[PDB]
């Protein structure tokens, strides 16, 4: 199948508060919380593509390897094919490109009457012997935020069957992330997220996306 690029686009909607990244650089003077990864220029939360790729890959290893997979070098050819493998000559360059996702709906939220685009959640832990409480604050990207999502798939030397299987793997990946969380304090209910208006477009070359679009909207 002669070269082509299919662009998977969606909006990530945060169903619960999300917390990813950041450091004491991006920090506000007198912030006491664990801050979030932010776009430096707008100081808005951003969902780093590194995160999305990471989580989707490690979840997909549980499904698609049927192997121990001690290090990502050891993943199956089907995952290495998509996410890339540094130690295999064939897969040194991967067919997927994840993109930093940026907040769309700031205006929607400003309308809904938010006084910031990030919430700081107070939590604590209560000692079970002494009953003493130790509190903690942590920043989260606010609930019902949306982020414009882009993932790029490259058809080069993979003729007929392989593109189909790859599409299956991408849909399985996203669904698995929907049935999991985007890295945060996930066990305590963070990072639940949903892919809205998930849609395929051929942005280079010639390919038929009718079948895929059907399979995306319903089956993911």
């Amino acid at each position: 199948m002669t070269f082509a690029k299919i662009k998977f686009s969606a909006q990530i909607r945060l169903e619960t508060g999300l917390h990813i990244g950041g450091s004491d650089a991006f920090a506000a003077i007198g912030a006491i919380d664990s801050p979030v990864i932010k776009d430096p220029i707008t100081n808005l939360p951003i969902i780093p593509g590194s995160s999305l790729k990471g989580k989707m890959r490690t979840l997909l290893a549980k499904v698609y390897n049927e192997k121990v997979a001690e290090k990502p070098s050891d993943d199956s050819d089907i995952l290495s094919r998509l996410f890339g493998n540094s130690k295999d000559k064939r897969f040194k360059m991967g067919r997927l490109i994840f993109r930093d996702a940026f907040l769309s709906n700031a205006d929607e939220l400003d309308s809904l009457g938010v006084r910031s685009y990030t919430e700081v959640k107070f939590e604590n832990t209560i000692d079970r012997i002494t009953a003493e409480a130790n509190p903690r604050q942590i920043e989260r990207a606010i609930r019902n935020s949306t982020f414009d999502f882009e993932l790029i798939y490259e058809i080069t030397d993979e003729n007929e069957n392989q593109v189909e299987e790859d599409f299956k793997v991408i849909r399985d990946g996203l669904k698995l992330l929907e049935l999991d969380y985007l890295g945060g304090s996930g066990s305590r209910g963070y990072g639940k997220v949903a892919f809205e208006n998930l849609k395929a477009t051929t942005v280079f070359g010639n390919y038929d996306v009718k079948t895929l679009n059907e399979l995306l909207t319903a089956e993911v």
Partner: protein, 123 residues
Amino acid sequence: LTDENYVDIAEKAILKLERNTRNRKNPDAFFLTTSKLRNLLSLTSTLFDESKVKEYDALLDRIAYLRVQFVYQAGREIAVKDLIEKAQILEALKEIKDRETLQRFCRYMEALVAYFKFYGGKD
């Protein structure tokens, strides 16, 4: 008023700030805790962050809200009201005509907090 040589002002305020001198180790012993400030600092920073892609004319609701929580919190705890006095914050707020003036005030808050933590404030 305050501008462009305001760090020296912020410091000059903070060294004047109220002290719990009773404590056995009561050095300067500030009565104040970053905990008390937090909300209005998240507010001030969100104001700065916001004034970059919006216009001084159309923000002023949020500047009311800032003054409000200043006074409210000034009521709710004594050391906050004390801070707002000795650093003349409430005088400063009413003085904000430009986006230049506003950004100056945001910076001022930053400075106050920095020198607070420096001089043995407890966060």
